[PDB]
Structure formats: C-alpha cells, structure tokens
Amino acid sequence: KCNTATCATQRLANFLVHSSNNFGAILSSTNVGSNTY
Amino acid sequence: KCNTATCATQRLANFLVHSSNNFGAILSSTNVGSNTY
Amino acid sequence: KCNTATCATQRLANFLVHSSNNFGAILSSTNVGSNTY
Amino acid sequence: TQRLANFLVHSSNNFGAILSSTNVGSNTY
Amino acid sequence: TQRLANFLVHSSNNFGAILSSTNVGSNTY
Amino acid sequence: TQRLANFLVHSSNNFGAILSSTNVGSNTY
Amino acid sequence: KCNTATCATQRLANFLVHSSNNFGAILSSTNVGSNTY
Amino acid sequence: KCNTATCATQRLANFLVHSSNNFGAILSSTNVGSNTY
Amino acid sequence: KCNTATCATQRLANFLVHSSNNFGAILSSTNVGSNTY
Amino acid sequence: TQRLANFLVHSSNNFGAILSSTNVGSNTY
Amino acid sequence: TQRLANFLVHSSNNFGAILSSTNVGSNTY
Amino acid sequence: TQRLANFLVHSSNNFGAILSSTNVGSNTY
C-alpha cells in the first residue's frame, strides 16, 4: 500500500448491541421540572 | 494504493442493534414541565 | 488508486437496526408543559 | 347572648403608579 | 339571642396609573 | 354573654411607584 | 355619653393635601412590559 | 363620659401634606419589564 | 371621664409634611426587570 | 487559482416525538 | 494555488422523545 | 500551494428521552 511516504490510517470498527428482553413488568417515571401541589 | 505520497484514510464501520422484545408490561411516564395542582 | 499524491478517503458504513417486538402491553405517557388543576 | 359589631373601612388612594401581578395557579413557559 | 351588625366600606380613589394582572389558573407558553 | 367590637381601618396612600409580584402556586420555566 | 357600659368609639380624622404646582417642565415615561426592537 | 364601665376609644388624627413646587425640570423614566434589543 | 372602671384610650396624632421645592434639575430612572441587549 | 468543492448533506429522520421552542427575541410575561 | 475540499454530513435519527428550548434573547417574567 | 481536505460527519441517534434548555441571553424573573 503505502510503500513510500506519509500514509495515515484510522481504522474504527464499532459494534453496539443493546437488547432488552423484558419478560415481566418494568415501570418507569421521569418527572423533570414537574411539580405536584 | 498510495505507493508514493500523502494518502490518508479514515475507515469507520458502525453497527448498532437495538432490540426490545417485551413479552410483558412496560409502563412509562415522562412529565416534563408538567404540573399537577 | 492514489499512487502519486494527496489522496484522502473517509469510508463510513453505518447500519442501524431498531426492532421492537412487543408481545404484550406497553403504556406510555408524555406530558410536556401540560398541567392538571 | 352575643352582641357583635364589626366595622371595616378600606380606603386606597393611589397618586402615582401601581403595577401588580398575581399568579395563583399559573405556569409560564 | 344574636344581635349582629357588620358595616363595611371600601373606597378606592386612583389619581394616577394602575396596572393589574391576575392569572388564577393560567398558563402562558 | 359576649359583647364584641372589632374596628379595622386599612388606608393606603401611594404617592410614587409600586411594583408587586405574587406567585402563590406558579412555575416559570 | 356612655355612663354605664360597653361603649367603644373609633375616631378617625384623615386629611390629605396633594398639591403640585409645576411652574416648569416635567417629563415622565412609564414603559411597563413594553419593548423596543 | 364613661363614668361606670368598659369604655374604649381610639382617637386618630392623620394629616398629610404632599406638596411639590417644581420651578424647573424633572425628568423621570420607569421601565418595568421593558426591554430594549 | 372614666371615674369608675376599665377605660382605655389610644390617642394618635400623626402629621406628615412632604415638600419638595425643586428649583433645578432632577433626573431619575427606575429600570426594574428591564434589560438592554 | 482557487479550486473549491463544498459538499454538504443534512439528513434528519425522526421516528418518535420532537418538541422545539426557539425565542430569539421574545418576552413572555 | 488553493485546492479545497470540504465534505460535511449531518445525520440525526431520533427514535424516542426530544424536547428543546432555546431563548437567545428572551425574558420570562 | 495549499491542498486542504476537511471531512466532518456528525451522527446523532437518540433512542430514549432528551431534554435541552439553552438561554444564551435570557432572564427569568
């Protein structure tokens, strides 16, 4: 390939595997800036 | 390829796998800026 | 390819797989700016 | 035997500038 | 035996500028 | 035997500038 | 007057004299909530 | 007056004299909530 | 007056004299909540 | 001797909910 | 002798909820 | 003799909730 001069190479292999198998109950509440009076 | 001069290469391989298999109940509430009086 | 000079190459391969198989109940509420009196 | 007398006088005299804001139960976004 | 007397006088005299805002139950976005 | 007398006078005289803000129950974002 | 019992008296004499004699120039600007772009 | 019993008296004499004699220039600006861009 | 019993008296005499004689220049600026960009 | 090449691609794919507020020069009272 | 190449790609993929507020030059009272 | 190459890729993938507030030049009272 670069036999003679100045050859730069960045090799990036990124693999992401997000898996959620929910055989059940997940409950979530996000209350940002909310208020209860 | 770049036998002589100044060859740059960025190689990016990105693979993302988001999988959600919900065999069940997911409950979610996002209350942003909301208010309850 | 670029035997002589000044060759640049950005190689980007992006693969995204979002899969949701919901064999069940998902409930979601987003209340932004909403208010309840 | 209750003898009750209540006398109330409210007197307001503005000779200038009044600015008022009340937000019982508001939300400003 | 209840003898009750209630006297109320409200008197407002503006000689200038009044500005008022009330938002019982409002939302401004 | 209750003999009760309540006398209340409220008198406000502005000769200049008044600014007021009240937010019982508000949210400003 | 109240020789025997339970006499109450509130005596209020209020006198207000606002006088402005302007032998000259008064300039005033009230800009409430106004905006200039 | 109240020779025998329970006589109360509040005596209030209020006198206010606001006088402005402006033989000259008064300049005033009140900018509440105003904005200039 | 109250020779026998329980006689209370509050005596209030209030006199206020605000006088401004401006033989000259008064300049005033009140900028509440105002902004200049 | 200027040789100029500018290539720009903007690609936006919403698969869900987007809420946006911009107040360049506003005032909410 | 200027040889210039500029390549820009912006790619945004929302798969969910986005909320944004920008107040360059605002005032909320 | 300037040979210039600039390559920029911005890629954003939200799979969830994003909340953002920016107040370059604001005032909240």
Q: Is K6 exposed, middle or buried (0-12, 13-18, 19+ CB in 10 A)?
A: middle
User: What resolution in Å is listed for this PDB structure?
Assistant: 3.2
Token duo for residue B25: 């109940």
Residue length of chain H: 37
Token duo for residue F4: 């009760």
Residue length of chain B: 37
Distance, CA of E11 to CA of D11 (rounded, Å): 5
Q: Are F7 and G6 inside 8 Å of each other by CB?
A: no
Distance, CA of K23 to CA of J21 (rounded, Å): 8
Cα→Cα distances I22→E4, G27, K21, Å = 53, 14, 50
Distance, CA of E20 to CA of I14 (rounded, Å): 31
List % helix, strand, coil for chain B (3-state, nearest 5): 0, 60, 40
Q: Are B35 and F29 inside 8 Å of each other by CB?
A: no
User: How many Cβ pairs within 8 Å bridge chains H and J?
Assistant: 4
- Residues near H8 by Cβ (< 8 Å), separated by ≥ 6? F5, G7, G8, G9, I7, I8, I9
Q: Are A1 and B4 inside 8 Å of each other by CB?
A: no
Residue of C nearest to E25 (CA): C37
Pick from D11, H9, G2, I7: nearest CA to F7 = H9
Calculate ∠ Cα H7-H12-H16, nearest 5°: 175
Distance, CA of E2 to CA of F1 (rounded, Å): 10
* Contact assessment for residue B33 and residue A34, using Cβ atoms and an 8 Å cutoff: yes
Q: How far is CA I27 from the centre of its chain?
A: 22
Token duo for residue H16: 């206010």
Position of tokens 């909340």? L19
The terminus-to-terminus CA distance of chain H in angstroms comes to 70
Q: How far is CA L8 from the centre of its chain?
A: 13
- Residues near G8 by Cβ (< 8 Å), separated by ≥ 6? D5, F5, F7, H7, H8, H9
Residue of A nearest to L18 (CA): A32
Pick from K27, B29, K14, A34: nearest CA to J20 = K14
Residue of D nearest to C35 (CA): D27
- Residues near L3 by Cβ (< 8 Å), separated by ≥ 6? C6, K3
Q: Are C14 and L15 inside 8 Å of each other by CB?
A: no
Distance, CA of J5 to CA of J3 (rounded, Å): 7
Q: How far is CA J29 from the centre of its chain?
A: 28
- Residues near A17 by Cβ (< 8 Å), separated by ≥ 6? B17
F2-13: b (≥16 Cβ within 10 Å) or e = eeebebeeeeeb
Q: Looking at chain B from residue 1 to 20, which residues have their Cβ under 8 Å from any Cβ of chain A?
A: 1-20
Q: What is the DSSP letter of F24?
A: T
Distance, CA of J29 to CA of J19 (rounded, Å): 22
Three-state SS string across D15-27, please? Answer: CCEEEEEECCCEE
